[PDB]
């Protein structure tokens, strides 16, 4: 679930995204919601 | 909304305005004297326009993670005013509303404690189904307002309106606080009160029906 | 020297087209940039968009649909137009010349620079308030002082004006004879748009028993004159 | 900011002039020798990966 990185759009058409995902952790039953950054070329849209 | 900063005459001032810097900034500072129009002090951070003294200095916009800062050293009496900052952040969109200004005030004489006088709503007002408490605050300096209405144990947040403090040809300022209630509410609680704090010193006076 | 004059009606009914005018002297209206800045009472200013020749004009995104701007070289003036005003538009509208700037943090080949604006010379402005309230006669109420309140004497005393519009109101005591210990705190503009003013007087606790304490309220727009006697 | 590569134009113009001179030996002294852009392919082939 990505949100475009903080930028002033003058076109800046940033490829960078800011995506939070439900990631696993050290324990099997537990999970965690962590975020990251990914360029436009690494991610595709899922309808 | 307003933020006050006390500075002794002839000493350095510290002014905070704006969010944390996410990109390279171009900060603008403005001077709004009481009643007058906002006048420009600093444009493009430390760089200033013609006719401005060097005591005003702006923090550089090259660093990231900090807030803008207008530094005034050895403040003269004329420098006291309201100061707004206009943020031009590369990461942030265009800002059309200035930041919350900082109210610089030279002490210009010793601190005075507020004189408070609380009056119950008029008996004539009960006939018109209107009840109003009046909390008068005067002979206080500086012009810092702290409204606190406590009906017995618990307070009432809504129904209160207060005006801006203004001096009346004296060091003191003029603060008047009001409260609109119903006749059945004045006889509901056992006693009301309006507390007034000033620079960390709270003064409380109560009132009870008859 | 640059002489900028801000002219406007100053009082406009709700849902009405507000129009102002900024007189300009010392320089042509077309050569320099122009901007409008309104400011609510007790709050921070607000950029209401700028205007310049060659189609250089941008608006505030919050009121972009309602705001308008225009210029004319012949008369050397700046005009502001706003349709459908409400009570939130009550502000002091300033008119100031603006200068642009170029701050570069990148290569500039890929638009890694941005333009910042700053207003150098301002004007007095005009105080514009939007309200539908008509002229209302003041209602006087007298606060009642406590009796023999303490060994310290000098009990208090005062009046109470309520629901009056518009300003100003002149408040005296005993038809000007009482001029000592007179407080007339500034009017508290209510949320409903009707001003309210109080006035208190410190009197001796001994003379509190029997004396003439009458506050007289005069209001010019309604030709109202009300006196009231205060006693414990 | 964007990732960018900066190459001096005097040197690139000078070297490019060395490559174009040699190429004429195979195709003739006076012929049009133009240089163009990538004509297609994946992101690998199209750019200087
Ligand atoms: C690949 O290539 C690209 C492209 O070549 C490279 O991109 C470059 O990357 C750099 C960093 O990676 C960037 O550096 C940053 O530069 C900026 C800008 O520096 C310039 O602009 C400054 C402001 O200029 C204005 O004010 C002047 C008066 O003070 C005035 O004379 C001037 O005309 C400008 O005014 C203009 O705007 C006014 C309105 O605002 C208007 O009224 C005016 O009429 C006018 O239109 C300017 O100060 C800078 O000049 C400094 O540096 C010059 C170097 O030639 C000096 O000659 C000059 O005296 C200044 O000195 C400063 O630096 C000196 C040491 O060098 C120091 O001694 C002195 O005290 C000063 O500090 C420049 O003109 C800067 O603000 C940032 O800090 C960065 O340094 C580049 O912008 C960017 N792009 C380019 C084209 O270079 C990329 O890096 C390459 N990558 C690789 C991997 O190779
Ligand atoms: C990519 O996406 C991720 C999310 O997936 C983004 O990560 C988020 O980034 C934002 C900031 O951009 C973070 O907000 C900040 O959170 C700080 C931590 O708050 C928590 O802990 C503090 C105590 O340590 C508690 O007080 C907080 O409790 C409160 O907040 C929650 C909501 O979060 C409310 O529900 C509660 O009622 C409380 O109010 C949290 O538990 C927080 O400290 C920080 O606050 C600063 O900024 C706010 C802005 O309104 C100010 O009001 C506040 O006073 C702080 O002000 C800072 O700046 C001023 C100068 O202007 C300084 O003077 C101050 O000292 C201070 O530095 C803010 O709320 C968010 O938490 C974070 N979330 C996650 C999951 O990571 C990435 O940023 C995003 N990145 C990109 C590139 O896009
Ligand atoms: C990270 O994982 C958590 C769960 O561990 C996600 O929270 C859940 O989000 C879903 C939607 O994707 C919520 O579903 C809701 O279901 C109701 C019907 O039951 C529907 O009406 C709503 O419209 C919605 O679809 C769910 O309630 C919610 N919370 C849980 C399961 O506790 C979270 O969204 C994940 N974050 C990501 C993937 O970024
Ligand atoms: C790439 O960057 C290097 C430096 O990292 C540049 O080398 C400089 O070249 C100039 C003369 O052109 C010298 O005056 C400098 O002293 C050199 N730098 C150092 C650290 O020695 C090089 O020219 C740059 N080339 C391009 C194409 O951008
Ligand atoms: C808030 C924001 O940045 N939205 C943009 C959206 O306008 C753009 O179409 C999309 C392209 O992938 O990236 C995101
Ligand atoms: C943001 O980009 C827009 C593009 O129109 C530009 O007009 C504006 O001045 C920029 N502002 C900032 C603060 O970068
Ligand atoms: C530089 O390139 C131009 C064509 O872009 C070419 O005409 C010119 O001759 C080149 N410079 C030299 C020294 O050959
Ligand atoms: C240049 O072209 C001429 C005429 O075609 C030819 O005679 C000669 O060998 C060529 N020289 C080179 C260096 O290619």
UniProtKB/TrEMBL annotation, chain A:
Glycans are attached at residues 1, 4, 8, 18, 22, 47. Disulfide bonds join 2-19. Highly glycosylated by host. The high number of glycan on the protein is reffered to as 'glycan shield' because it contributes to hide protein sequence from adaptive immune system. It is found in: Host cell membrane; Host endosome membrane; Virion membrane. Envelope glycoprotein gp160: Oligomerizes in the host endoplasmic reticulum into predominantly trimers. In a second time, gp160 transits in the host Golgi, where glycosylation is completed. The precursor is then proteolytically cleaved in the trans-Golgi and thereby activated by cellular furin or furin-like proteases to produce gp120 and gp41. The CD4-binding region is targeted by the antibody b12. Belongs to the HIV-1 env protein family. HIV-1 lineages are divided in three main groups, M (for Major), O (for Outlier), and N (for New, or Non-M, Non-O). The vast majority of strains found worldwide belong to the group M. Group O seems to be endemic to and largely confined to Cameroon and neighboring countries in West Central Africa, where these viruses represent a small minority of HIV-1 strains. The group N is represented by a limited number of isolates from Cameroonian persons. The group M is further subdivided in 9 clades or subtypes (A to D, F to H, J and K). The mature envelope protein (Env) consists of a homotrimer of non-covalently associated gp120-gp41 heterodimers. The resulting complex protrudes from the virus surface as a spike. There seems to be as few as 10 spikes on the average virion. Surface protein gp120 interacts with host CD4, CCR5 and CXCR4. Gp120 also interacts with the C-type lectins CD209/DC-SIGN and CLEC4M/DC-SIGNR (collectively referred to as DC-SIGN(R)). Gp120 and gp41 interact with GalCer. This is Envelope glycoprotein gp160. It comes from Human immunodeficiency virus type 1 (HIV-1). The lineage of its organism: Viruses, Riboviria, Pararnavirae, Artverviricota, Revtraviricetes. The gene is env. The chain holds residues 129 to 176 of 860 of the full protein.
């Amino acid at each position: 679930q990505c949100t475009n990185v903080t930028n002033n759009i003058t076109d800046m058409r940033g490829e960078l995204k800011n995506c939070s995902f439900n990631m696993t952790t050290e324990l099997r039953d537990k999970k965690q919601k962590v975020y990251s950054l990914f360029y436009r070329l690494d991610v595709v849209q899922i309808n | 909304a307003p933020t006050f900063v006390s500075v002794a005459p002839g000493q350095t001032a510290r002014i905070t305005c704006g969010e944390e810097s996410l990109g390279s900034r171009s900060v603008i500072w403005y001077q709004q004297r009481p009643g007058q129009a906002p006048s420009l002090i600093i444009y493009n951070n430390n760089d200033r326009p013609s006719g401005i003294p060097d005591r005003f200095s702006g923090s550089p916009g090259s660093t990231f993670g900090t807030t803008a800062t207008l530094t005034i050293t050895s403040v003269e009496a004329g420098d006291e005013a309201d100061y707004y900052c206009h943020i031009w952040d590369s990461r942030r969109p265009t800002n059309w509303v200035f930041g919350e200004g900082t109210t610089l005030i030279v002490l210009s004489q010793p601190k005075a404690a507020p004189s408070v006088t609380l009056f119950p709503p008029s008996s004539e007002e009960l006939q018109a189904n209107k009840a109003t408490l009046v909390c008068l605050i005067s002979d206080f300096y500086p012009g810092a307002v702290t409204v606190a209405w406590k009906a017995d144990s618990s307070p009432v947040k809504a129904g209160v309106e207060t005006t801006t403090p203004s001096k009346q040809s004296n060091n003191k300022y003029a603060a008047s606080s009001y409260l609109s209630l119903t006749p059945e509410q004045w006889k509901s609680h056992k006693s009301y009160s309006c507390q007034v704090t000033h620079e960390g010193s709270t003064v409380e006076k109560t009132v009870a029906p008859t | 020297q640059v002489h900028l004059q801000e002219s406007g009606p100053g009082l406009v009914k709700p849902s009405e087209t507000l129009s102002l005018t900024c007189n300009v002297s010392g320089t042509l209206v077309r050569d320099n940039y122009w901007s409008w800045i309104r400011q609510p009472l007790g709050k921070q200013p607000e950029w209401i968009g700028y205007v310049h020749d060659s189609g250089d004009t941008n608006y505030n995104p919050s009121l972009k649909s309602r705001v308008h701007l225009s210029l004319d070289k012949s008369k050397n003036l700046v005009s502001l137009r706003l349709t459908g005003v409400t009570a939130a538009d009550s502000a002091i509208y300033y008119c100031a010349t603006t200068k642009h700037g170029r701050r570069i943090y990148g290569v500039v080949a890929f638009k890694e620079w941005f333009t910042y604006f700053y207003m150098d010379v301002w004007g007095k402005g005009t105080s514009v308030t939007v309200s539908s309230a008509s002229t209302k006669g003041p209602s006087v109420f007298p606060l009642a002082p406590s009796s023999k309140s303490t060994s310290g004497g000098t009990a208090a005393l005062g009046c109470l004006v309520k629901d009056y519009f518009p300003e100003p109101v002149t408040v005296s005591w005993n038809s000007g004879a009482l001029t000592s210990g007179v407080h007339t705190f500034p009017a508290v503009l209510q949320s409903s748009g009707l001003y309210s003013l109080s006035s208190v007087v410190t009197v001796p606790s001994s003379s509190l028993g029997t004396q003439t304490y009458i506050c007289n309220v005069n209001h010019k727009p309604s030709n109202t004159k009300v006196d009231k006697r205060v006693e414990p | 900011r964007q990732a960018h590569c900066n190459v001096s134009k005097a040197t690139w113009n000078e070297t490019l002039g060395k490559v174009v001179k040699q190429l004429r030996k195979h195709f003739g002294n006076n012929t049009i020798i133009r240089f163009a852009n990538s004509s297609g392919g994946d992101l690998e082939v199209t750019t200087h990966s």
